[PDB]
Design a protein around this ligand. Sequence first.
Ligand SMILES: CS(=O)(=O)N1CCCCC(=O)N2CCc3cc(ccc32)Nc2ncc(C(F)(F)F)c(n2)NCc2cccnc21
Length: 250
Amino acid sequence: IAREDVVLNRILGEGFFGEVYEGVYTNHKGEKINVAVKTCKKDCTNKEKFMSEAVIMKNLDHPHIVKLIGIIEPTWIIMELYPYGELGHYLERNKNSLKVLTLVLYSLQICKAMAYLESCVHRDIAVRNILVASPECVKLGDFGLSRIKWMSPESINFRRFTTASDVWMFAVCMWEILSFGKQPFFWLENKDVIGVLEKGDRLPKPDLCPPVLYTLMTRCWDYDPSDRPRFTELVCSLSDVYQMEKDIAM
Ligand SMILES: CS(=O)(=O)N1CCCCC(=O)N2CCc3cc(ccc32)Nc2ncc(C(F)(F)F)c(n2)NCc2cccnc21
């Protein structure tokens, strides 16, 4: 991509490596696309991790992961912009109008993204880091995509981070979604989390959450990571919950 084909309109926010801008990319066929432009600070050491995380994104293609459009090799990563913004905020603003079928759909879409990644891990599966492409489509963000109140017991007790630990974190994300964006364990200080988990206590069932889905979340929070469902199983389970909620709804 040539720099002249990308115009910056305003600040979006401060990314991990530097500022992110809202802009417009115009095709070699001359069509306009709203984009998010990731930059690197001129003070950066990480400048190589920044490009290598971009190479990874360049090689990913999934309907439920944010799309990289191209890389202007000051180095800019051109991502597709999703103007509805973050899922957390979207849930909070729309909680009067959102139905449970849609929250289950978002969960299923993220689960498919995770199943794909498993076929890489994602260390920030959380509603603040998920983008809303449209009212019926969400996209896992790039930040945290790689090769405390969100973390598995083994991740806390022993610094281990496996796919089974991502399944734990995924159910936390599901809990956030079904709670309309509430923070997991907002009632606790970090130091208290593991003791609660060790006693067998878990995030409580959100009000809107179908009991079958809470039972699913509960399995994902099995203390022994080997007993937790795998992402492929979860896709099937969630697809069943979704189809059922669809019939119940209409
Ligand atoms: C902190 S940041 O990383 O700068 N940032 C911007 C947060 C702005 C919040 C807001 O008011 N708004 C209102 C308008 C808006 C549109 C979008 C995000 C937020 C907001 N859309 C968007 N699409 C794609 C990407 C990318 F494809 F690139 F992921 C992206 N953002 N990445 C940016 C980002 C993704 C997650 C979490 N935070 C941030």
